[PDB]
């Protein structure tokens, strides 16, 4: 049982937001706003339909007319980038939640993925383990393209990948572990990770010579 | 005040979960129980910390003891699958919320974290870079708590966890890094990464290398 709110609403740094929740009756109910970083801990951002819970900043504003209430944040920014909710809190214990609302914010610079590549470490070596590990890390937008070589040939088969996920700057995160034996380490000259963010390749390489 | 929220809850068709919220001045708080099943409108389950709202059951119980508040759930179906997260009002102006326990039902066997940890690379080095990279894969269910220290101190600085997601063989991964410079490493005779899990806590170590 849900509230009506719109799902999506784009804007740019600077604009400003305006997220409702009609519905009939809304005005019985004191109401209230959470945010959701795409994933995490949600944030009371508003409560009693006009206050600002401490900590939080003074560019979200809330109010109400009769059917509706609204979501004012004057100076949207990218770190606003989250999901936004309306709880609505009527009188007989009942509370109810719009499906939520998207705030994608525009013009985010595409930005280059950092990639790095990392050989097994001693103690796994010491263990009869060697693990690569390939950090794609402050790309965006969200999708990246993985490859393994070994020394000329394509790793197939060894492979697993993160799925993008959101740091903490608007800009995401994914990996890539190939397994093998210390037998297949220290054998080719080396091993690579190829990385294709969206125009651009990166290729970055290890060899067994591991240093101590 | 840190609220201490666990990761997952896999109960058997049937036993009764035991979520819990213990953060550091539980007294003061009036605890909310927010459940939110695959994105979705969350729904509150428990108030006031044992008041329910209106059309909810009472297979649904919530409670205080000094620093615990802990949240009940009798003849767990697969329907009561989510997120549940705890709100904590801090009296006065502020809240504060658990971080989530993704309750599961079993439906595949609970799979520990394989961590392991790698220092800088001998290339990153030249590149005056160096990367802490803590790799977690193969968990069952999917949720992780990662931790860092740095001669047994904590570091929030830097450290960018990924998001679990479904690697090829239906278990998770995940990952965590942090971002220092080459003098830091070397400054530190120890580092430490720390995963813990749905029961099962673990931390694997590496210090620094030299060769030359």
Redesign the interface.
């Given at each position: 049982y849900?509230v009506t709110q719109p799902p999506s609403l784009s804007v740019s740094p600077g604009q400003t937001a305006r997220i409702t929740c009609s519905g009939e009756k809304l005005g019985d109910a004191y109401v209230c706003w959470?945010q959701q970083r795409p994933?995490?801990?949600?944030?009371?951002v508003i409560y009693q339909d006009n206050r600002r819970?401490?900590?939080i900043p003074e560019r979200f504003s809330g109010s109400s007319s009769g059917n509706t209430a609204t979501l004012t944040i004057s100076g949207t920014q990218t770190l606003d980038e989250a999901d936004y909710?309306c709880?609505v809190w009527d009188s007989?214990?009942?509370?109810?939640?719009?499906?939520?609302t998207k705030l994608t914010v525009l013009g985010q610079p595409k930005a280059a993925p950092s990639v790095?590549?990392?050989?097994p470490?001693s103690?796994?070596l010491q263990a009869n383990?060697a693990?690569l590990?390939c950090?794609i890390?402050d790309f965006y937008p969200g999708a990246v393209t993985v490859a393994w070589k070994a020394d000329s040939s394509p790793v197939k088969a060894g492979v697993?990948?993160?799925?993008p996920?959101?740091?903490?700057n608007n800009k995401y995160?994914?990996?890539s572990?190939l397994s093998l034996t210390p037998e297949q380490w220290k054998s080719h000259r080396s091993y690579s990770c190829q990385v294709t963010h969206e125009g651009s390749t990166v290729e970055?390489t290890?060899a067994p010579?591991?240093?101590?």
């Open positions: 849900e959470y994933g995490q801990s949600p944030v009371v819970p401490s900590g909710y709880q007989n214990a009942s509370v109810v939640f719009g499906g939520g790095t590549l990392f050989p470490s103690e796994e383990k693990t590990v950090l890390s697993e990948t993160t799925t996920s959101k740091q903490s995160a994914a990996s572990y970055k290890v010579t591991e240093c101590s």
